[PDB]
Amino acid sequence: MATKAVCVLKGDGPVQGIINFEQKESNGPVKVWGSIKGLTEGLHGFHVHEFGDNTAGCTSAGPHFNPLSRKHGGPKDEERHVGDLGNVTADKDGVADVSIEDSVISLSGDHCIIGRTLVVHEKADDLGKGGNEESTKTGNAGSRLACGVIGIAQ
Amino acid sequence: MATKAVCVLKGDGPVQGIINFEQKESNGPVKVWGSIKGLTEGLHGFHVHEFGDNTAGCTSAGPHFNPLSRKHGGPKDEERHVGDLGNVTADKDGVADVSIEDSVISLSGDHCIIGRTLVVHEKADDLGKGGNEESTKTGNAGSRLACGVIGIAQ
Ligand SMILES: OCCCCCCCC[C@H](O)CO
Ligand SMILES: OCCCCCCCC[C@H](O)CO
Ligand SMILES: OCCCCCCCC[C@H](O)CO
Ligand SMILES: [Zn+2]
Ligand SMILES: [Zn+2]
Numbered sequence: 320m321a322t323k324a325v326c327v328l329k330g331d332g333p334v335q336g337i338i339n340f341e342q343k344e345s346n347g348p349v350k351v352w353g354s355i356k357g358l359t360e361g362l363h364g365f366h367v368h369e370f371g372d373n374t375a376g377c378t379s380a381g382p383h384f385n386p387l388s389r390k391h392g393g394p395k396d397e398e399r400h401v402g403d404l405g406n407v408t409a410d411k412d413g414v415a416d417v418s419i420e421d422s423v424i425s426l427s428g429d430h431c432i433i434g435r436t437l438v439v440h441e442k443a444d445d446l447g448k449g450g451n452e453e454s455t456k457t458g459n460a461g462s463r464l465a466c467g468v469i470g471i472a473q
Numbered sequence: 474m475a476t477k478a479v480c481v482l483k484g485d486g487p488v489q490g491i492i493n494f495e496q497k498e499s500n501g502p503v504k505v506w507g508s509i510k511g512l513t514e515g516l517h518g519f520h521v522h523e524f525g526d527n528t529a530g531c532t533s534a535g536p537h538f539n540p541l542s543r544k545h546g547g548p549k550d551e552e553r554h555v556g557d558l559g560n561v562t563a564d565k566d567g568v569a570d571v572s573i574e575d576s577v578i579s580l581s582g583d584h585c586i587i588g589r590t591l592v593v594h595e596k597a598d599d600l601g602k603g604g605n606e607e608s609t610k611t612g613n614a615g616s617r618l619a620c621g622v623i624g625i626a627q
Contacts, residue, residue: 324588327527337528371587371624373481374491381627433525433588434478434625468622470525471588473535 320345320427325472326437330377330465333357338417338437340469342426349426351404351419355439355465358409364440364460365417367402367424367469371434377463380436382456386429390455393446394421401430403458406444415439438466474499475580479626480591484531484619487511492571492591494623496580503580505558505573509593509619512563518598518614519571521556521578521623525588531617534590536610540583544609547600548575555584557612560598569593592620 324340336355342348368380383391384402392399401423407415424432440460449459478494490509496502522534537545538556546553555577561569578586595615603613 321588325524325526325528369625370479370627371622372479372626373621373624374479429474434475434623436624467527468525468624469588470527470590470622471523472526473524 321433321471322426323472324426324433324469326467326469328355328437328439328465328467330463332464334439334465336465339472340426345427348420348422349424351417351421353417355407355409355415355417356413358413358415358439358464360409360411360413362406362408362443363415364442364444364458365404365407366438366440366460367404367432368436368438371436371468373436373466373468377436377438377466380438380463380466384432384435391447391458394423396447399423402432405446407439432469433471435469436466437469438463440464475587475625477626478580478587478623480621480623482509482591482593482619482621484617486618488593488619490569490619493626494580499579499581502574502576503578505571505575507571509561509563509569509571510567512567512569512593512618514563514565514567516560516562516597517569518594518596518612519558519561520592520594520614521558521586522590522592525590525622527590527620527622531590531592531620534592534620538586538589545601545612548577550601553577553601556586559600561593586623587625589623590620591623592617594618
């Protein structure tokens with residue numbers, strides 16, 4: 320179905336960016352790329368949350384998109400949430416030049432992420448290996464710095 | 474599959490609101506309701522535009538969602554864009570208490586509006602009866618006051 324999507328990330332602080340999605344083949348991987356600025360240098364959790372609901376800020380996006388009811392993992396684990404895209408890295412200028420390819424999210428079908436929320440988080444995603452309960456839910460990535468609803472793009 | 478959706482409308486000016494969508498059956502109408510404030514009193518065109526793309530503000534949402542390549546109409550017309558939801562009315566306090574039921578838009582299938590952009594416009598939508606070229610495209614509803622990407626709601 321849909322082959323391109325886009326997300327404008329905004330929040331209460333300086334974090335903002337534009338993230339593109341492209342899926343040339345409905346049964347193939349999604350390319351995810353763009354630039355997020357205003358970030359502290361280092362790793363930031365980067366997840367699709369379940370609801371494209373921004374009525375109370377990023378909070379109402381709910382938890383990670385998890386249609387298979389699995390535990391949080393890194394994108395390369397079999398045990399992952401569908402929304403588990405891992406970390407993005409911001410450089411010393413505060414910019415994350417995102418470049419991710421993922422074969423679990425989709426722009427169509429039951430793993431469709433259109434109309435859900437992309438969130439860039441305060442802290443690193445421990446990829447579910449943090450040894451606490453929070454690790455298996457959010458990877459301890461902390462608060463939601465910026466988010467946007469993922470929309471169909473031209 | 475999706476039975477509820479939500480949209481947060483923001484723009485460069487004071488217009489803002491929250492619009493809810495509910496479709497209990499996929500073969501059935503979508504209820505559209507909520508409140509938009511900061512509007513001038515009177516009629517305002519209220520349309521789903523094609524792209525859930527807010528990268529350059531409301532302008533990048535593209536034209537009215539129109540997968541059947543029809544001319545613009547009011548919601549009651551057989552000739553209408555899928556995104557043609559007519560006018561909403563703002564009271565003397567600047568508030569549009571939206572209450573619409575439509576069976577052309579859907580929260581699934583070909584006519585799915587999740588991941589697309591809801592826009593409230595400057596002027597009245599002439600429902601395609603204005604007799605100029607613009608009426609058959611936008612209803613002469615004028616600029617985009619506020620918009621948001623339609624997202625899956627809990
Ligand atoms: O993806 C490449 C450009 C992304 C960086 C642009 C900063 C954010 C601009 C606004 O949020 C978009 O309305
Ligand atoms: O939605 C109920 C009213 C529909 C009729 C709106 C007429 C707008 C005419 C304006 O002068 C167009 O330039
Ligand atoms: O867009 C065209 C449909 C609405 C046309 C209604 C015009 C109202 C005329 C009245 O005489 C105003 O005093
Ligand atoms: Zn997760
Ligand atoms: Zn139209």
